[PDB]
């Protein structure tokens, strides 16, 4: 039957029971051993309560707030007998504060985003940099520096951020192998970074194309997506952000750097979900992606940084999201930005509504000798329905990643605060791959300068096709 | 009991039998007296032939080219017994040359676009300026100066260009009534221009929202539209163009003017269908439109120009398209520009495939004492099917405009080369209105500054809400 990877010897506290929580619960029940009364879900939504009740799980209908999270979570996470697991799959809660709470009390932790307490994302009195994922991530890195070691807490371990970090490692190994480069795999951050440098990887797109669609057309004045609408709009309205490669010779006028932190990123003074980049996936071939800020855009570029003895970065790949969401979400963005306000209503397409499609999600490594290499999942809604309940393909890539992170955390429970880039990528993918559908590596000769210049003057660098100058849409 | 307006006692030569030809023929049959054998349809496609044969109409399966159009069309236009009518609804043919040919042979002429011979729109040797609708229109104006008066030829008399010119006049009349401006209704171009100036009309959007959708979702790698795909893509890849108002205080860096001609327009060095503008319609409320070049953008601005004794323009409204096509077309544009090439295939949604929706098409007059006024048609597909065969709502707005133009031409056959702006707008709308569904005027307090600036610094002009600086979306 299904593998049972581990016994959880304590409370399992799932915060949030939206599209991801709903998809993750069945995997937790499937793959871990524990008494049913150990698991409890926390979510303020009536919709969520009704679904939870239907699934026969304990449910606390409460919003976790700055004011109550200590009083609520400390007792639940320390119920016993042994180590509990905080599975944080929420919006509007502080990943940092909850993470630190769990660690203080010896509870394992995992989430899929560095979320802030409600009132951050759309605070007009915060400058764009202060609303950046770069900034949010730095609070986690600072927490790690302040308290090294201790109980394992896994930050940003969903599909992307999360799984894609493992894909990058696998892709690097595949590229090397395809070039006839043999020998031991890297085992340290420094060795991974040097592998990327040595193979001449100039940059990386998180290259995604979601082709899922419903039996009904997009309703007017309704934002439609295959996962969190609130979450997508939140990051969509954050500044465009990207890990910034050492090979880049140009940046936009409204690009800005950071005075502090790991040094791996820049941001643009414009919303990422209204910023387009030229990208590519196997099924989409050439496409527009949206340059939506994402944790991995920074974490991957940071991870793969090579520094000299003075500590100056000598190599680093460009890294960023190039997101083509489902067609109804594309229309939803057009509608939202076109009106200058969020729609009156929203909905997440679920399994019962989606007629066909895949969530093609992978990493596009470019600039090396074989030009460009896409590695990732082509999971279809059809396969999803066969192998996991209560979610679509988008949800399953995420929930299975949380599963992998949980297994890893349980197996490595004294590793301290860790990112997806810190995990054993082979073990994680071993656990996750049964839920990822086709996992393939594809080379292409496409570049951002394909068919260019066109009928109008363009600001392009023909000496280096993958320069951000050629990727960013400026029309 | 449909009205039969006039007898056409000469040959009726329809060039092109696509979506508009198919919608227009039955209106010609319905509203004109003539012997059915004197109608001839010319179109190179097999699809066209089979539709024409099904209607028992004489058909010539030939592409009209610069090499054959004289020897092909002259005998058809002059067949007698009386004055013929060339109804040009084609692509890839020269409106100018065919128009001049008709005029030379005493035949009436009408079309819906200043189309060039095949090889013009995507000619890499042409400068962007030469590819502009401004330039193409100047060839018609030059033809009129060279041969003033004579047989009537109606240039660009579809829905837009065409009908919307009449909408502008009606809107100006309504606005004057609502604003308490007293006087005789204008009866010359000078008086119309003066009225617009006196009412304080800063600019005009051709503000359109097409909500038609089919029983099937958009297919991958197929461009979908509700009218000509070839036609729409052609103008979509022409430079963005607009009639340029005297009130404008700013233009983008890649804006350019013209050294000669009527002087009413500028163009941008970027494709119009990948240029977004902030606009508004009654059903859409605030929306993105695409700044696709259109003849009326220049012709309306030119028509409403006030000049001093020296010949300098002292008033002129901004005028341009703000097009939100059907959702499948929005997706098609995203797909096309995203891949950097036209889709492998295309289809026009017809009356058998469309489930619901309207083509909300009107003119948005702004800058005056009541901020903004939208006047136009909200024709639905349901209403369309009730009153006209073989076309969707988009097609009927066009075909009925051609009908009106044809009635006008027959009633004024010695008026020379004329634009929609030169026609008796009341007579034309009298003929067209039965086919336009609700025709309404709607005020709004919305402006392009509404809700701005947001979370990011924006390059706006807070002093004058309707400045192009605020309307244009700047990637
Ligand atoms: N890294 C990745 O690949 C992905 C990450 N995510 C993230 O995971 C989180 C969940 O995503 P979805 O389940 O799709 O979102 P969703 O919008 O479907 O559900 C979010 C849930 O959080 C609940 N919630 C709101 N305020 C709360 C509070 N104060 N305390 C507890 N719960 C609260 C809501 O009631 C809702 O049920 C989001 O933060 C999202 O950004 C989502 C998908 C992919
Ligand atoms: N002003 C307006 O409101 C308006 C709106 C819609 C379309 N139009 C214009 O009307 C024209 C027709 O639109 P449509 O939707 O019917 O287009 P369509 O693409 O459906 O049909 C065009 C037809 O032209 C024919 N054709 C191609 N080359 C030809 C040639 N050399 N000689 C004769 N025929 C040829 C094709 O076979 C096709 O049947 C286009 O130029 C379009 O831009 C104007
Ligand atoms: N803040 C959440 C962002 C991470 C992406 N989340 C959802 C997955 C959608 C794309 N697979």
We report the CATH number of the domain holding residue A327 as: 3.30.360.30
Q: Decide: B395 in ligand 2 pocket, CB within 6 A.
A: no
Q: Which of A247, A466, A278 is nearest to A372 (CA)?
A: A466
* Residue that the structure tokens 């959007």 belong to: B205
User: Is-contact B328 B317, C-beta < 8 A?
Assistant: no
In this structure, are strands B222-225 and B345-348 parallel, antiparallel, or unpaired?
Answer: parallel
| Residue A195 sits at the chain B interface (C-beta within 8 Å) | no
| Residue A271 sits at the chain B interface (C-beta within 8 Å) | yes
- Which residues of A are less than 8 Å from B327 in CB distance? 217-218, 331
Helix (H) / strand (E) element for A42: namely strand A39-42
A120 plus A193 within the same structural domain: no
Q: What is the dihedral of CA A408, A409, A413, A415, to 10 degrees?
A: 90
B264 plus B312 within the same structural domain: yes
Q: Which of B355, B361, B343, B346 is nearest to B440 (CA)?
A: B361
Give the contacts of B211 (CB within 8 A, at least 6 positions apart). Answer: A220, B283, B326, B327, B356, B357, B358, B359, B360
Give the whole-angstrom CA distance, residue B278 versus residue B271. Answer: 17
A103 plus A166 within the same structural domain: no
Residue B180 CB neighbour total at 10 angstroms: 7
Interface of B with A in 204-223 (CB under 8 A): 211, 213, 217-218, 220
| Residue A294 sits at the chain B interface (C-beta within 8 Å) | no
Q: Which of B342, B345, B348, B344 is nearest to B328 (CA)?
A: B348
**Which runs of E-coded beta strand occur in A73-189?**
85-88, 108-110, 153-155
* Residue that the structure tokens 């004109």 belong to: B32
The residue to mutate among A15, A17, A20, A363, having the most atoms of ligand 1 within 8 angstroms of its beta carbon, is A20
Query: Distance of CA A235 to CAs A35, A447, B470, Å?
Result: 37, 27, 25
Give the contacts of A173 (CB within 8 A, at least 6 positions apart). Answer: A185
Distance, CA A79 to ligand 3 centroid (Å)? 31
Q: Please tell me the total number of residues recorded for chain B in this structure.
A: 475
User: Is-contact A354 A348, C-beta < 8 A?
Assistant: no
Supply B360's token pair.
């909300």
Q: Decide: A362 in ligand 3 pocket, CB within 6 A.
A: no
Give Dmax (Cα) for chain B.
70
Contact A278 B338 (CB under 8 A): yes
Supply A226's token pair.
């295959």
Q: Which of A324, A320, A322 is nearest to A209 (CA)?
A: A324
DSSP assignment of B122-173: T-TTS-GGGGSHHHHHHHHHHHHHHS-SSS-EEES-BBTTBHHHHHHHHHHH
Q: Which residues pair with A224 in a beta bridge?
A: A347
Give the contacts of B360 (CB within 8 A, at least 6 positions apart). Answer: B208, B209, B210, B211, B281, B282, B283, B284, B376, B377, B378
A-B Cβ pairs (cutoff 8 Å, strict):
91
Q: Which of A331, A216, A233 is nearest to B284 (CA)?
A: A331
Give the contacts of A382 (CB within 8 A, at least 6 positions apart). Answer: A356
Distance, CA A88 to ligand 1 centroid (Å)? 9
Contact B217 A217 (CB under 8 A): yes
Residue B1 CB neighbour total at 10 angstroms: 3
CA A133 to chain centre: 12
Residue A34 CB neighbour total at 10 angstroms: 17
Helix (H) / strand (E) element for A314: namely strand A313-315
A91 plus A121 within the same structural domain: yes
* Residue that the structure tokens 């340290």 belong to: A188
User: Is-contact B48 B348, C-beta < 8 A?
Assistant: no
Give the whole-angstrom CA distance, residue A89 versus residue A15. Answer: 6
User: Is-contact A361 A377, C-beta < 8 A?
Assistant: yes
Q: Which of B234, B231, B226, B223 is nearest to B209 (CA)?
A: B226
A74 plus A103 within the same structural domain: yes
User: Is-contact B207 B322, C-beta < 8 A?
Assistant: yes
User: Is-contact B155 B140, C-beta < 8 A?
Assistant: yes
Q: Decide: B348 in ligand 2 pocket, CB within 6 A.
A: yes
The full 3-state SS of chain A, as one line of letters, equals: CCCCCEECCCCEEEECCCHHHHHHHHHHHHHEECCHHHEEEECCCHHHHHHHHHCCCEEECCCCCCCCHHHHHHHHHCCCCCCCEEEECCCCCCHHHHHHHHHHCCCEEECCCCCCCCCCCCCCCCCHHHHCHHHHHHHHHHHHHHCCCCCCEEECCEECCEHHHHHHHHHHHHHHHHCCCCCCCCCCHHHHHHHHHHHCCCEEEEEEEECCEECCCCCCCEEEECCCHHHHHHHHHCEEEEECCCCCCCCCCCEECCCCCCCCEEEEEEEHHHCEEEEEECCCEEEEEECCCCHHHHHHHHHCCEECCCCCEEECCEEEEEEECCHHHHHHHHHHHHHCCCCCEEEECCCCCEEECEEEEEEEEEEECCEEEEEEECCEHHHHHHHCCCCCHHHHHHHHHHHHHHHHHHHCCCCCEEEHHHCCHHHHHHHHHHHCCCEEEEEECCCCCCCCCCCCCCCCCCCCCCCHHHHECCC
B61 plus B181 within the same structural domain: no
Kindly report the backbone phi and psi dihedral angles of residue A281, in degrees, each rounded to the nearest multiple of 5, phi listed first: -135, 165
3-state SS class at A236: helix
CA A101 to chain centre: 23
Kindly report the backbone phi and psi dihedral angles of residue B207, in degrees, each rounded to the nearest multiple of 5, phi listed first: -100, 110
| Residue A2 sits at the chain B interface (C-beta within 8 Å) | no
Give the whole-angstrom CA distance, residue A197 versus residue A195. Answer: 5
Supply B119's token pair.
């090889």
DSSP assignment of A11-31: -EEEE--SHHHHHHHHHHHHH
Supply A35's token pair.
């008494």
User: Is-contact A450 A286, C-beta < 8 A?
Assistant: yes
In this structure, are strands A265-271 and A255-256 parallel, antiparallel, or unpaired?
Answer: antiparallel
Give Dmax (Cα) for chain A.
70
Q: Which of A272, A203, A276 is nearest to A241 (CA)?
A: A272
A120: burial class by Cβ within 10 Å (0-12, 13-18, 19+)? Answer: middle
How many H helices and E strands in chain B? 14, 25
User: Is-contact A131 A233, C-beta < 8 A?
Assistant: no
Give the whole-angstrom CA distance, residue A456 versus residue A446. Answer: 21
Alpha carbon nearest to ligand 3 atom 6, residue: A160
Kindly report the backbone phi and psi dihedral angles of residue A159, in degrees, each rounded to the nearest multiple of 5, phi listed first: -75, -50
3-state SS class at A110: strand
Q: Which of B399, B403, B404 is nearest to B427 (CA)?
A: B404
Kindly report the backbone phi and psi dihedral angles of residue A388, in degrees, each rounded to the nearest multiple of 5, phi listed first: -155, 135
Q: Which of B386, B388, B414, B383 is nearest to B401 (CA)?
A: B388
Give the whole-angstrom CA distance, residue B269 versus residue B292. Answer: 12
Give the whole-angstrom CA distance, residue A377 versus residue A167. Answer: 9
CA A138 to chain centre: 16
Give the whole-angstrom CA distance, residue B379 versus residue B363. Answer: 15
3-state SS class at A41: strand
Query: Distance of CA B128 to CAs A294, B91, B300, B308, Å?
Result: 39, 20, 22, 31
**B241-257: b or e for each residue (b if 16 or more CB lie within 10 Å)?**
bbbbbbbbeebbeebbe
* Residue that the structure tokens 């924006």 belong to: B458
Give the whole-angstrom CA distance, residue B268 versus residue B129. Answer: 9
Kindly report the backbone phi and psi dihedral angles of residue B368, in degrees, each rounded to the nearest multiple of 5, phi listed first: -85, -175
B388 plus B413 within the same structural domain: no
Q: Which of A214, A157, A149 is nearest to A353 (CA)?
A: A214
At CA A162, angle to CA A425 and CA A233, rounded to 5?
170
Give the whole-angstrom CA distance, residue B204 versus residue B243. Answer: 9
**For testing contact with chain B, the best of A241, A455, A457 (most B CBs within 10 A):** A455
3-state SS class at A72: helix
- Which residues of B are less than 8 Å from A449 in CB distance? none
**Rg of the Cα atoms in chain B:** 21
B150: burial class by Cβ within 10 Å (0-12, 13-18, 19+)? Answer: middle
Helix (H) / strand (E) element for B210: namely strand B203-210
Supply A131's token pair.
């609303």
Supply A129's token pair.
């940099």
Give the whole-angstrom CA distance, residue A235 versus residue A294. Answer: 8
Indicate the angle between helix axes A295-303 and A189-199, nearest 10 degrees: 90
Q: Please tell me the total number of residues recorded for chain A in this structure.
A: 475
Give the whole-angstrom CA distance, residue B436 versus residue A451. Answer: 42
Supply A79's token pair.
């119920």
- Which residues of B are less than 8 Å from A288 in CB distance? 334, 337-338
Kindly report the backbone phi and psi dihedral angles of residue B344, in degrees, each rounded to the nearest multiple of 5, phi listed first: -65, -30
CA B274 to chain centre: 19
Supply A132's token pair.
């950046």
In this structure, are strands A276-281 and A285-290 parallel, antiparallel, or unpaired?
Answer: antiparallel
User: Is-contact A358 A385, C-beta < 8 A?
Assistant: no
Where does A304-364 have alpha helices with state H?
A: 327-339
In this structure, are strands B108-110 and B306-307 parallel, antiparallel, or unpaired?
Answer: unpaired
Give the whole-angstrom CA distance, residue A24 versus residue A157. Answer: 12
Domain count, chain A: 2
Supply A356's token pair.
């066909």
Give the whole-angstrom CA distance, residue A275 versus residue A321. Answer: 11
B294 plus B419 within the same structural domain: no
User: Is-contact A398 A112, C-beta < 8 A?
Assistant: yes
Helix (H) / strand (E) element for A255: namely strand A255-256
User: Is-contact B324 B292, C-beta < 8 A?
Assistant: no
A200 plus A258 within the same structural domain: yes
B81: burial class by Cβ within 10 Å (0-12, 13-18, 19+)? Answer: exposed
* Residue that the structure tokens 């269908």 belong to: B273
Give the whole-angstrom CA distance, residue B238 versus residue B126. Answer: 11
B287: burial class by Cβ within 10 Å (0-12, 13-18, 19+)? Answer: buried
**Rg of the Cα atoms in chain A:** 21
Kindly report the backbone phi and psi dihedral angles of residue A356, in degrees, each rounded to the nearest multiple of 5, phi listed first: -165, 180
Rounded to a whole number of angstroms, the distance between the first and last alpha carbons of chain A is 54
At CA B451, angle to CA B445 and CA B453, rounded to 5?
135
B271 plus B295 within the same structural domain: yes
Kindly report the backbone phi and psi dihedral angles of residue A364, in degrees, each rounded to the nearest multiple of 5, phi listed first: -105, 100
Give the whole-angstrom CA distance, residue A219 versus residue A328. Answer: 9
* Experimental technique for the deposited model: X-ray
Q: Which of B137, B146, B152, B59 is nearest to B99 (CA)?
A: B152
Supply A90's token pair.
């929420």
A157: burial class by Cβ within 10 Å (0-12, 13-18, 19+)? Answer: buried
DSSP assignment of A186-224: P-SHHHHHHHHHHHT--EEEEEEEE--EESSPPPTTEEE
User: Is-contact A26 A39, C-beta < 8 A?
Assistant: no
Helix (H) / strand (E) element for B51: namely helix B46-54
| Residue B454 sits at the chain A interface (C-beta within 8 Å) | yes
Helix (H) / strand (E) element for B324: namely strand B318-324
Supply B95's token pair.
């409106």
| Residue B183 sits at the chain A interface (C-beta within 8 Å) | no
Give the whole-angstrom CA distance, residue A207 versus residue B112. Answer: 43
* Residue that the structure tokens 């414009």 belong to: A270
User: Is-contact A80 A126, C-beta < 8 A?
Assistant: no
Query: Distance of CA A405 to CAs A6, A166, B190, Å?
Result: 12, 11, 75
Give the whole-angstrom CA distance, residue B95 versus residue B111. Answer: 7
Indicate the angle between helix axes B189-199 and B295-303, nearest 10 degrees: 90
Give the contacts of A311 (CB within 8 A, at least 6 positions apart). Answer: none
Supply B129's token pair.
């300026």
Give the whole-angstrom CA distance, residue B350 versus residue B34. Answer: 28
Domain that holds residue B291: 158-402+424-475
3-state SS class at B13: strand
Give the single-character DSSP code of B41: E
We report the CATH number of the domain holding residue B132 as: 3.40.50.720
A327 plus A340 within the same structural domain: yes
For residue B283, the chain A residue with the least C-alpha distance is A220
Kindly report the backbone phi and psi dihedral angles of residue B322, in degrees, each rounded to the nearest multiple of 5, phi listed first: -135, 80
B433 plus B418 within the same structural domain: no
DSSP assignment of B404-471: HHHHHHHHSTTS-EEEGGGS-HHHHHHHHGGGS--EEEEEE---TTTT-S-SS-----TTSTT-HHHH
Give the whole-angstrom CA distance, residue B159 versus residue B155. Answer: 12
Contact B340 A451 (CB under 8 A): yes
CA A65 to chain centre: 24
């Amino acid at each position: 039957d299904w593998p049972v990877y581990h016994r959880i010897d304590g409370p399992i506290v799932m915060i949030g029971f939206g599209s991801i929580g709903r998809g993750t619960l069945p995997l937790i029940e499937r793959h871990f051993a524990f008494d049913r009364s150990k698991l409890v879900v926390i979510d303020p939504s009536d919709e969520a309560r009704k679904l939870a009740e239907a699934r026969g799980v304990r449910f606390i209908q409460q919003a976790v707030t700055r004011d109550n999270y200590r009083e609520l979570l400390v007792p639940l996470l320390t119920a016993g007998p042994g180590q509990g697991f905080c599975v944080n799959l929420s919006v509007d809660t502080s990943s940092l504060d909850i993470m630190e709470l769990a660690r203080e009390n010896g509870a394992l932790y995992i989430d899929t985003v560095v979320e802030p307490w409600l009132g951050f994302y759309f605070d007009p009195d915060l400058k764009p940099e202060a609303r950046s994922n770069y900034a949010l991530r730095e609070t986690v890195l600072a927490a790690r520096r302040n308290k090294p070691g201790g109980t394992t807490a896994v930050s940003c371990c969903g599909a992307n951020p999360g799984m894609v970090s493992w894909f990058v490692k696998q892709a690097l190994v595949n590229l090397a192998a395809d070039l006839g480069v043999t020998g031991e795999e890297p085992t340290t951050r420094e060795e991974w970074a040097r592998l990327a440098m040595d193979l001449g990887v100039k940059g990386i797109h998180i290259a995604e194309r979601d082709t899922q669609r419903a039996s009904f057309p997009k309703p007017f004045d309704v934002f439609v997506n295959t996962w969190s609408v609130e979450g997508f709009v939140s990051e969509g309205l954050q500044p465009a952000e990207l890990g910034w490669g050492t090979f880049e010779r140009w940046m936009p006028d409204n690009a800005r750097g950071h005075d502090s932190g790991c040094g791996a990123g820049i941001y643009l003074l414009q919303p990422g979900a209204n910023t387009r980049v030229r990208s590519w996936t196997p099924t989409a071939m050439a496409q527009y992606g949206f340059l939506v800020t994402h944790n991995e855009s920074i974490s991957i570029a940071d991870f793969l940084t090579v520094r000299d003895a003075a500590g100056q970065a000598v190599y680093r790949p460009t890294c960023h999201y190039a997101y083509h969401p489902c067609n109804d979400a594309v229309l939803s963005l057009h509608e939202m930005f076109g009106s200058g306000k969020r729609q009156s209503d929203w909905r997440i397409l679920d399994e019962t509504e989606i007629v066909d499609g895949i969530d093609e999600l992978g990493v596009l490594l470019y600039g090396h000798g074989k030009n460009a290499y896409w590695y990732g999942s082509q999971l279809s809604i059809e396969e999803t329905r066969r192998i996991a309940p209560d979610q679509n393909a988008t949800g399953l890539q995420v929930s299975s990643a949380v599963l992998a992170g949980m297994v890893w955390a349980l197996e490595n429970p004294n590793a301290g605060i860790v990112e997806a880039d810190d995990l054993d990528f082979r073990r994680c993918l071993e656990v996750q791959t049964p839920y990822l559908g086709p996992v393939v590596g594809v080379y292409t000769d496409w570049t951002p300068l394909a068919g260019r210049p066109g009928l109008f003057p363009e600001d392009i660098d023909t000496s280096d096709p993958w320069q951000f100058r050629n990727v960013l849409v400026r029309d």
